[PDB]
From a paper:
Cytoplasmic dynein-1 (dynein here) is a conserved microtubule-based molecular motor. The lissencephaly 1 protein, LIS1, is mutated in type-1 lissencephaly and is a key regulator of cytoplasmic dynein-1. At a functional level, Lis1 is a dimer of two β-propellers.
We revisited our cryo-EM datasets of human dynein and LIS1 and, with additional processing, solved the structures of human dynein bound to one and two LIS1 β-propellers to 4.0 Å and 4.1 Å, respectively. In both structures, dynein is in the closed ring conformation and the linker domain is disordered before the hinge region. The conformation of dynein is the same regardless of whether LIS1 is bound only at sitering or both at sitering and sitestalk. Human LIS1 is pivoted around the stalk helix relative to yeast Pac1 to a larger extent than at sitering. R3206 is in position to form a salt bridge with LIS1 D151, which is made possible by the rotation of LIS1 in the human structure relative to the yeast one. In the human structure, the LIS1stalk-AAA4 loop interaction is primarily mediated through backbone interactions. However, the chemical nature of the interface is also different: while the yeast Pac1-Pac1 interaction is moderately hydrophobic, the human LIS1-LIS1 interface is more electrostatic, which may compensate for the smaller surface area.
Author numbering:
A (entry chain A): 2817 to 2859, 2865 to 3214, 3473 to 3814
B (entry chain C), C (entry chain B): 91 to 263, 268 to 297, 308 to 410
Write the structure that this text describes.
């Protein structure tokens, strides 16, 4: 009908004069003026999601979003089974992007330019769309000492594979290899004409003519002249080959590329792939945490809504508020790096993979902490049920009053379990936000970020507990003592850093000026036979597979000489060949141990990083702060002046350590030993000796009080004399 | 095919447990059964092969009973920690947890249409819930004591309940009170359509009542007349259910024995060496020739039917 | 007597699988069907009664394909755990297991003579094994990548196969390559001898090939000339088979529809809304008026022919 012609008219309008716009105001302008001109020239014509596809029929038909989402989800499951198996969530605009790359791959010479923020999936989405369209994907690989001759060899081989072999090929690449001066000319010619002269000279010309002979014979056309066969080769390249370039949204880069490659902006099709809008953030947060039990029936709405995502439900639900906060904690990083740019600091790229790791850490921490808390409450229940049995049934009264304090502590911990279920979600939210977003900030800005997040959550009436330290929640005493025994400085910042280096979703960088963090991370994983190398080391190529196959962790320094060959490792583009896991490196394919992690470290703390590493690696800063410096400032001066007092302080602190550990072990042994017997406690007499032998070993708490008194009374010799010196000297260091 | 009766030996004897059993059921579609326990655990074994698949954790106290939706995706469980947990059997993780019960929950039952769930607890109240949201839509009361078990009819309109008050109460979402029992009523079971013709010549709707008085009594739902009474159990009855064809009744009691009752002839037909310790509960597969019994003996034996 | 065609509603709708379905096939002799699933399992059902018969578990990874000897005793299966398992369909036990494929094996096929078995796998090679010993006797090569499926002709002298290279290859125990598909080729079907007359009206041997283009094509094997192209599927093709008499072609595609085509007129006639999701495989009973379709949706449907 007429209306269908209007639909295709408007679809072409919105896919030619809206795909390359930058700001949302321009898009609103285009859509509204399309509506007005449609009203003017032709008095459900304009259903909001104008959409067209050929995957619900044999030809180009309108489609609806829901069944398209179902189809692409099933086909993406098949894609997982076939190629990569990287869990990808489906939000709204990804469908639009998928249909757009499909449309351009349908067109001959369907070259694409995708202006998108690094980490936004502009490569893997293109691979996914290319896969179902019968389009094999060829990606360039960059190694050390990469020259133009290697790239020319790749171009010769693939042009043979596309011209004479007659198989459809796509070229999804980014700036990585494009940097060199000789690279740009070949693409400026290829995207323009489809043939690149002065490239096939030598015996290569003769052998590709020989191959084109059999190619033309198989196609069915007889050719026996070099020039006409070369024309057929060119026409085949026009038929089969596709090139997709992905660029970061840099104004200077765009101007330079428009200057040095007009055909790249003339022949290719433009798509401002861009960054994820707040709608996309809301959709990802909603759908990735839809399976989690974040529902609170007793949620009360505040009067004032902090609105960072529009079109919210007027009454919001608890999960809706949580995902709203998940959007807020991502816009807060934008605000923070804006402040850091305005003050004159160094800013890192803000990529959606940060948000993805934030949500993954949210789910992981939520699951783990809920499980542990329920397990300990189960222990509490069985212990109370075994003490009440003892009560129902002298040495028995002595044994019942001996466990009186433990019984009181357990009973007091029991009744607050509802409040512990209440504030699990907010605590885990703040924890995950600190894990993901606070990687590359100093102490003061980290505190500022946490304070703003706390203010936002308080404004939203989201329940969380403030009387708990950031390092205390994410780590228990045992691992903290292990870290302190692994040459980690005893301060909150390095505690957080150790939490990053153990509990992470992505492989990290270490920003260490002194190299003490290298010693700490070498001592931590020494049991797994840690080994160290560097990017500039010539044996690193040999060492990579030796680390990967046997699973021994690898430590790599000097990341300012970064080799992109680790790109599959960072993204974990693994495949399962049944009982084995296979990974690719461009040169060779090798197995992976189930347990493997690579450690990356940076020496110079002021190195600006390209967004390719920013989007695929997290950050930790081993900086120095006021109290942190004061610690070794007091230790050094005390050692220099009074060796005896320093030795006494070290011994007292150590003896506090293992004795606190002993107290914890006694509590655990009194809990578990009580539970793991079903024979009425009174009836058992072997039991009474052990369950009153361990309560009697809990009198070392008074010894612990004794050296506690000693340390807090003998510290006045130091802390009341060297405090001003330490304060002035730390101020001196920062000045 | 309406006449396969259990016979020994047990097809499989699964003792991979560290505490007694409370309930056992077959998954409606997939060939798997599940078992509840007092150790705050729900265990998933394949009865067709007898291999261990996984364990479901998350409850903190004794899991009192478990129920399945008609679809076979939504799994419900209740325990003594006041909570009713909804489990995605596909994803194997607690979709949501329920709060509001004042004291211990004995049983829950997903309604056949799979949109609501109803629960029975020690506060002498019956609560019906919205599965998708977790909001308590309504609460039925009138019972005097612990509501030991509640079961809905095949159409969801009528829900029956038993308690320590010895009165089986039924109401339409008190229609009838059945107070003549000599002792606590332990378990109930709606009669299937297959037994309608058999019951008619033996003498709706029609309902059972298993009790701690060592008797099993069949009932008329509308008028509440005790249609008959099976006799012969030596201890407290814990589970009563009909055969798939409605011709037999499979029952268990604490007499360490599983009995098969021909209610047409009003007599016990067959008795099995159920378990060394008391028989907790039973269940009869709708179609396949398998039946299962899990006992307070830390074992979940599967009888084959001939 | 060559014109019974499937029509709705289905004779049976069996939902026992815990996972999607990869193949469905009828036994040559007994009135039973057999299907392989993603859960590393095979299921044997009775299509006449629609009742579950058994499960030949033993595989570790997803069983993708299954094939029978004519005698009905030896059953072949292949799965992604690198292996090919030969089973006694009388004793229901793995007679033997063969290894050697470097990656996932997609398809196997017992030759009609029952002396050897051919297998195709992700490593772009085809291997021919002894049925009674399990020794790799032959290894055809030359595919660039995954051999999606392999089939021998009626006498077994000639073997055809389809891969991701869009090049349906045929060779004697390379004779021909068919390389004018627009996309990956999923399934093939050696045309029956009974079509030799009808195709002569429509226009050897003669070979089918369905592909991700939504295009089924019939081809001359000896000359390699593309003979015709049925189009009309709204998604990827996954299965194609001729009618018993060669008068119609039944095909399955991911359009949630099973199509019945008259290739003489070169047009669709009948369309069956098979399942709510992807249809992965089909089969035609050689004599009985029934067919089978297995879908991603975990449901196997037996379709009544009239
Ligand atoms: N929407 C998304 N959902 C999940 N993962 C994503 C998404 N976008 C990107 N990724 C991650 O990024 C990796 C590939 O990103 P890529 O397409 O190379 O983006 P870029 O080209 O900007 O680096 C994958 O390993 C994937 O895990």
């Amino acid at each position: 009908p007429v209306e269908g012609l209007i639909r295709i008219w408007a679809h072409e309008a919105l896919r030619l004069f809206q795909d390359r716009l930058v700001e949302d105001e321009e898009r609103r302008w285009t859509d509204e003026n399309i509506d007005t001109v449609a009203l003017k020239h032709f008095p459900k014509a304009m259903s909001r999601p104008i959409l067209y596809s050929n995957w619900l029929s044999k030809d180009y038909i309108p489609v609806d979003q829901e069944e398209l989402r179902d189809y692409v989800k099933a086909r993406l499951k098949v894609f997982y089974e076939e190629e990569l198996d990287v869990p990808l969530v489906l939000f709204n605009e990804v469908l639009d992007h998928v249909l757009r790359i499909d449309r351009i791959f349908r067109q001959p010479q369907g070259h694409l330019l995708l202006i998108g923020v690094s980490g936004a999936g502009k490569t893997t989405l293109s691979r996914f769309v290319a896969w179902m369209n019968g389009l094999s994907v060829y990606q360039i690989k960059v190694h050390r000492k990469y020259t133009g001759e290697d790239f020319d060899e790749d171009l010769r081989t693939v042009l043979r594979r596309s011209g004479c072999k007659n198989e459809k090929i796509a070229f999804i690449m980014d700036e990585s290899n494009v940097l060199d001066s000789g690279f740009l000319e070949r693409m400026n010619t290829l995207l323009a004409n489809g043939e690149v002269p002065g490239l096939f000279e030598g015996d290569e010309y003769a052998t590709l003519m020989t191959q084109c002979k059999e190619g033309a014979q198989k196609e069915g056309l007889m050719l026996d002249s070099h020039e006409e066969l070369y024309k057929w080769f060119t026409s085949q390249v026009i038929r089969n080959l596709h090139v997709v370039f992905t660029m970061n949204p840099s104004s200077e880069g765009l101007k330079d590329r428009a200057a040095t490659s007009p055909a790249l902006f003339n022949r290719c099709v433009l798509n401002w792939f861009g960054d994820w809008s707040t709608e996309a953030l809301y959709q990802v947060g909603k759908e990735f945490t839809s399976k989690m039990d974040l529902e609170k029936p007793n949620y009360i709405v505040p009067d004032y809504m902090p609105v960072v995502y529009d079109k919210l439900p007027q009454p919001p639900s608890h999960r809706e508020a949580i995902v709203n906060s998940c959007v807020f904690v991502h816009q807060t990083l934008h605000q923070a790096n804006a402040r850091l740019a305005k003050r004159g600091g160094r800013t890192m790229a803000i990529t959606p993979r940060h948000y993805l790791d934030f949500i993954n850490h949210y789910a992981n921490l939520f699951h783990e902490k809920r499980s542990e808390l329920e397990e300990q409450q189960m222990h509490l229940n069985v212990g109370l049920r075994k003490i009440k049995e003892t009560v129902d049934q002298n040495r028995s009264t002595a044994l019942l009053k001996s466990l009186s304090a433990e019984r009181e502590r357990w009973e007091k911990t029991s009744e607050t379990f509802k409040n512990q279920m209440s504030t699990i979600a907010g605590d885990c939210l703040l924890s995950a936000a600190f894990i993901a977003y606070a990687g590359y900030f100093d102490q003061q800005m980290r505190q500022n970020l946490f304070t703003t997040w706390s203010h936002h959550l308080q404004q939203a009436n989201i329940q969380f507990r403030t009387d708990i330290a950031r390092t205390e929640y994410l780590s228990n005493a045992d691992e903290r003592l292990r870290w302190q025994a692994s040459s980690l400085p005893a301060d909150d910042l390095c505690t957080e850093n150790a939490i990053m280096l153990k509990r992470f979703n992505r492989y990290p960088l270490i920003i260490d000026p002194s190299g003490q963090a290298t010693e700490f991370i070498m001592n931590e994983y020494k049991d797994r036979k840690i080994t160290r190398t560097s990017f500039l080391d010539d044996a690193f190529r040999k060492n990579l597979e030796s680390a990967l196959r046997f699973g021994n962790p690898l430590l790599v320094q000097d990341v300012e000489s970064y080799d992109p060959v680790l790109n599959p490792v960072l993204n974990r583009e693994v495949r399962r060949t049944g009982g084995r896991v296979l990974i690719t490196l461009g040169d060779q394919d090798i197995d992976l141990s189930p347990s493997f992690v690579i450690f990356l470290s940076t020496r110079d703390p002021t190195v600006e990083f390209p967004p390719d590493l920013c989007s695929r690696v997290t950050f930790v800063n081993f900086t120095v702060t006021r109290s942190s410096l004061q610690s070794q400032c007091l230790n050094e001066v005390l050692k220099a002046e009074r060796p005896d007092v320093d030795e006494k302080r070290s011994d007292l602190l150590k003896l506090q350590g293992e004795f606190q550990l002993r107290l914890r072990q006694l509590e655990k042994s009194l809990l578990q030993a009580l539970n793991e017997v079903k024979g009425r406690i009174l009836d058992d007499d072997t039991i009474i000796t052990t369950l009153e032998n361990l309560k009697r070993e809990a009198a070392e708490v008074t010894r612990k009080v004794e050296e506690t008194d000693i340390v807090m009374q003998e510290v006045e010799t130091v802390s009341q004399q060297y405090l001003p010196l330490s304060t002035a000297c730390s101020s001196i260091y920062f000045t | 095919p309406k006449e396969w009766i259990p016979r020994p030996p047990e097809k499989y004897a699964l003792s991979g447990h560290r505490s007694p059993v409370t309930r056992v059921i077959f998954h409606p579609v997939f060939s798997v059964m599940v078992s509840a326990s007092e150790d705050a655990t729900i265990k998933v074994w394949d009865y067709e092969t007898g291999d261990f698949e996984r364990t479901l954790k998350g409850h903190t106290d004794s899991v009192q009973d478990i129920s399945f939706d008609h679809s076979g995706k939504l799994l419900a469980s209740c325990s003594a920690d006041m909570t009713i947990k909804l489990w995605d059997f596909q994803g194997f993780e607690c979709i949501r947890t329920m709060h509001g019960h004042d004291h211990n929950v004995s049983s829950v039952a997903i309604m056949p249409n799979g949109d609501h769930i109803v629960s029975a607890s020690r506060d002498k109240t019956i609560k019906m819930w919205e599965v998708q949201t977790g909001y308590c839509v309504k609460t039925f009361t009138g019972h005097r004591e612990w509501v030991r078990m509640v079961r809905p009819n095949q159409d969801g309109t009528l829900i029956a309940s038993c308690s320590n008050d010895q009165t089986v109460r039924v109401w339409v979402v008190c229609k009838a009170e059945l107070r003549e029992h000599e002792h606590v009523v332990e378990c109930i079971s709606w009669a299937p359509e297959s037994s309608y013709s058999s019951i008619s010549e033996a003498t709706g709707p029609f309902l059972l009542s298993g009790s701690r008085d060592k008797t099993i009594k069949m009932w008329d739902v509308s008028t509440g007349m005790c249609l008959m009474t099976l006799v012969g159990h030596d201890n407290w009855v814990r589970g009563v259910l009909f055969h798939s064809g409605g011709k037999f009744i499979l029952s268990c009691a604490d007499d360490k024995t599983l009995r098969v009752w021909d209610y047409k002839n009003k007599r016990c037909m067959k008795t099995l060496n159920a378990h060394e310790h008391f028989v907790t509960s039973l269940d009869f597969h709708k179609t396949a020739p398998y039946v299962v019994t899990g006992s307070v003996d830390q074992t979940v034996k599967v009888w084959e039917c001939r």
